[PDB]
């Protein structure tokens, strides 16, 4: 009746500094469907973020993909902030180039 | 193609 979301933060293509790419936050296996997902750059919320249409898996758990255009550098910290009924505090997952 | 309109209530 209540499942916590799996969260993955990653790029569409293998990250190379100073070359355009897409930042993805993939939330899956959660229930119920009310969820908050923000993409952050250095703590600041990114405005132009799109997301897929709400769907679900064989076990009825929901999944969503949030994404935005970005140009990765070495210092800029990117993260995904997720809010859910099953989440005590806002869960923050940092983007790792190699994950 | 979406399924035809439901004919019986829950």
């Amino acid at each position: 009746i209540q499942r916590t979301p799996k969260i993955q933060v990653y790029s569409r293509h293998p990250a190379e500094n100073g070359k355009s790419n897409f930042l993805n936050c993939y939330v899956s296996g959660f229930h119920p469907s009310d969820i908050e997902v923000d993409l952050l750059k250095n703590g600041e919320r990114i405005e132009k973020v799109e997301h897929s249409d709400l769907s679900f898996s064989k076990d009825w758990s929901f999944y969503l993909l949030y994404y935005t255009e970005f140009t990765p550098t070495e210092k800029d910290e990117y993260a995904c902030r997720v809010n859910h009924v099953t989440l005590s505090q806002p869960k923050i997952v940092k983007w790792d180039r190699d994950m | 193609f979406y399924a035809p309109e439901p004919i019986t209530s829950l």
Binding site: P32, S33 | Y2, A3
Partner: protein
């Protein structure tokens, strides 16, 4: 290969905000191609794949009407369900429906789907015979009796065996190689220091389609999972998928490990080493 036309429908009640939220999405195999959102600026059915713009206006109008009728039905069914379970504290509740058809490469109906879940768990499902119903609890026995005497199984049987397969073949014709595609994964192994005694090797598979894939690690010819981390297969956002599998190995011994990638687009499995 086998193919699937699926619709995933979600209805969520919203205490104080009046009408529930209603979302329906359609998938051909691993590809979304249509959507309906009651909260859009635009409560109409609209395309989500680049090969669906060749359908006329009448298609979209009919899809929209069927959608709205279903939304009406879910609006009733949310109330019905809160009655059946005697839920008195109000609150937001969820009703989901999945329906559609899985066909074989010989266009045999492998499986007709018509099933419902309430608040995260199974409520009622049409069986594979497409004649009988499975009801998850005593509340769903009410519904099951109703649909039994009403003949719903026949009604949806006609659709699942007819319209569903028909339009699935049609969508496969329209999309063609954008759907019947096979993108072999682009694979590579990365190296990441950890401590004095061990390091991390990560095997990447990127940009593949369809989503089904299997990664394995071996030590001089034999499989490992003694410390293997495997992430869920994820959408890249461009219609392809990604996956990686990492292992913690002793320092100096990295050159004894191999990654193995298995995918439809790889006639022979890939063997990689750092």
């Amino acid at each position: 290969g086998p193919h699937s036309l699926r619709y995933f429908v979600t209805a969520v009640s919203r205490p104080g905000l009046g009408e529930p939220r209603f979302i329906a999405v359609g998938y051909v195999d691993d590809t979304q191609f249509v959507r309906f959102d009651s909260d859009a600026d635009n409560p109409r059915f609209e395309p989500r794949a680049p090969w669906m713009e060749q359908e006329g206006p009448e298609y979209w109008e009919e899809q929209t009407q069927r959608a709205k009728s279903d939304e009406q039905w879910f609006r009733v069914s949310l109330r019905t369900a809160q009655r059946y379970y005697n839920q008195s504290k109000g609150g937001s509740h969820t009703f989901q429906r999945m329906f559609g058809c899985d066909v074989g490469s010989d266009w045999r109906l492998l499986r007709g789907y018509q099933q419902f879940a309430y608040d995260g768990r199974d409520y009622i499902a049409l069986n594979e015979d497409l004649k009988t119903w499975t009801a998850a609890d005593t509340a769903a026995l009410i519904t099951r009796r109703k649909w039994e005497q009403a003949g719903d199984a026949e009604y949806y049987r006609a659709y699942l065996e007819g319209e569903c397969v028909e339009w699935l073949r049609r969508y496969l014709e329209l999309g063609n190689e954008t759907l019947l595609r096979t993108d072999s994964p682009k694979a590579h192994v990365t190296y990441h220091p950890r401590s004095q005694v061990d390091v991390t090797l990560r095997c990447w598979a990127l940009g593949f389609y369809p989503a089904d894939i299997t990664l394995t690690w071996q030590l001089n010819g034999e499989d490992l999972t003694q410390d293997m981390e495997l992430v869920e297969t994820r959408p890249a956002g461009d219609g392809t998928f990604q996956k990686w599998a990492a292992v913690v190995v002793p320092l100096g011994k990295e050159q004894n490990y191999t990654c193995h990638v298995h995918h439809k687009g790889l006639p022979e499995p890939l063997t990689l080493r750092w």
